[PDB]
Amino acid sequence: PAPLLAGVTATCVALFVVGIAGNLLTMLVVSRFRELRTTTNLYLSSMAFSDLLIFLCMPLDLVRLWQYRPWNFGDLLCKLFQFVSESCTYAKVLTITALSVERYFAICFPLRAKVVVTKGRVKLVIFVIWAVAFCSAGPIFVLVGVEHEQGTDPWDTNECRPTEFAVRSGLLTVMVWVSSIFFFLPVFCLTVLYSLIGRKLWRRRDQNHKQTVKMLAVVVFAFILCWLPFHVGRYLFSKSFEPGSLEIAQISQYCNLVSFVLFYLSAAINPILYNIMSKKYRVAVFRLLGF
């Protein structure tokens, strides 16, 4: 138990450096190079900002996986570092869904997309996604709040955990189910749209097409692998607070740390997943750097 935390922290720090570097590179390249100011790059720039904040919130989460009971960083901080986190997560998933939609319209309906999709109608999508992400994660304020246990003074046992009102009333369970939409809707959208893109590409014919459907399958697999443990863990955390559950005491806290590593792994690999095969991006990151 005690040594594992060392590995999980070191992995998180490694993901922190890789993610911050990738997200900064993405934003800088998109900002300075006009040829790379495409709709896809705009989505990735928004996603990069989302991953950047998910990373900025990593030190606070790493603190709780390290120390939980003496927490005295403030109630407003406890809300803020779990609100920006759960809001950026929902904008990250929504942005992935938007990228899948743009890819589908661009490939399946190439000529109609040129007329229909414009930067004006992409800025609106970004704004809508961010608004929905903030609104969906607003109830974290009414749920995540510092609480103290009687028998010791306030500073002695404060834990930045969901309130007991959320556990006595079925507020938590409802919000671990409302969050599940953020998994079911993207997984369905990505799988159906990407399969349609693969169908069209395969029908048209090539090695390049095989590479393309391999990439689509890889992004789908990464999404499922990264997110299914997270939602399973949060659902187990909802059942944990119910009576009769002591096996789930071990199950949730372990699924929840695997879901912690995968959560940061997603943010680290997402800039790589969507930009590694764009030659214009690679030549611009080489232009931006000395190499």
């Binding site: 779990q82 759960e86 005491a249």
Partner: peptide, 12 residues
């Protein structure tokens, strides 16, 4: 944000 459990889920 991965939910984490208090090390004191005694429920007593």
């Amino acid at each position: 944000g991965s939910x984490f459990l208090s090390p004191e889920h005694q429920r007593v």
